[PDB]
Structures are given as C-alpha cells and as structure tokens.
Amino acid sequence: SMNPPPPETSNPNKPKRQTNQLQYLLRVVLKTLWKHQFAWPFQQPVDAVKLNLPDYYKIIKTPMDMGTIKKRLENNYYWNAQECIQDFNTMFTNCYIYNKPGDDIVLMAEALEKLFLQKINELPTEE
C-alpha cells in the first residue's frame, strides 16, 4: 500500500550522449504526448497512497511515467533511442496490466500510444 521510491532519473557514472534520435524523442515524442488532454495521469509516478490503490505496486514491478521520462531525456540519461522507447512501452503496458479494458485510464493510454506510434514511425535515421 506504500509508494516505492521513484525510478532513477540521474546516474552520474552512466555514460551519456546526445543523438538526433534522442533529441527527437524529447522535442517531438515527449512534447506531443505531454501536451495532450489525456497526459495528466501519466505526468508523474502513480501515487498509490493518494489514489488508494494499495495493490498497484504489488502488481507493477517496473513503474514508469512520463515525468520520469521527461527528466531522463532532459538529464541526457539515455545512451540510445531504444532505451527511451522501452520506457514509454513499459508505461503503457503497466496501465494495460493493472487496469481493465474500457477503463478511462486505458482509453487514455490507448490515445497516447497511438500518437506515440505515429511519431516513432518517423524517428529520424541516426546521423
């Protein structure tokens, strides 16, 4: 029933780089999803205490949210695009695992995921 510590967003010993794909993931992908009308539940870790979801973190062992993704991208946390893409997919999948078809949050995830897919479909070639 308690909240876990949030995922890490900084690790000074992780090697970093700034690729055109990672720049796209921030400037296009994250920006598009973050501004969406359905973004709000996903802009920070699930607060299982405030939401009274005492079994959330019993079921979800790899939490992810866009607040975390945003900080990771802004801190150059990633080495490659695939790591960031995996974070977004973890976020969606968590929502699908925990929730039920047709729940509001699932419809929201689905809308964001459709936009995600459209954007990732045009991920630029690494230069």
Ligand X SMILES: CCOc1cc(-c2c(C)noc2C)cc([C@@H](C)O)c1
Binding-site size for ligand X (CB under 6 A) equals 11
Give the nearer residue to ligand X in terms of CB position, either 52 or 121: 52
Q: Cα–Cα distances in Å, from 12 out to 4, 29, 75?
A: 22, 25, 10
Which residue's CB is nearer to ligand X, number 17 or number 50?
50
Range 60-99, binding ligand X (CB under 6 A): 95, 98-99
**CA-based torsion, 93, 94, 100, 106: positive or negative:** negative
Residue 107 CB coordination number (10 Å): 13
Does 115 interact with ligand X (rule: CB under 6 A)? no
Using the Cα atoms of residue 112, residue 115, residue 119 and residue 120 in order, give the sign of their dihedral: positive
Nearest distance from residue 118's CB to ligand X, in Å?
22
At closest approach, how far in Å is the CB of 26 from ligand X?
22
104 binds ligand X (CB under 6 A): yes
Here the tokens at position 68 are: 């975390």
- Residues in touch with ligand X (CB under 6 A): 41-42, 46, 51, 53, 95, 98-99, 104-105, 108
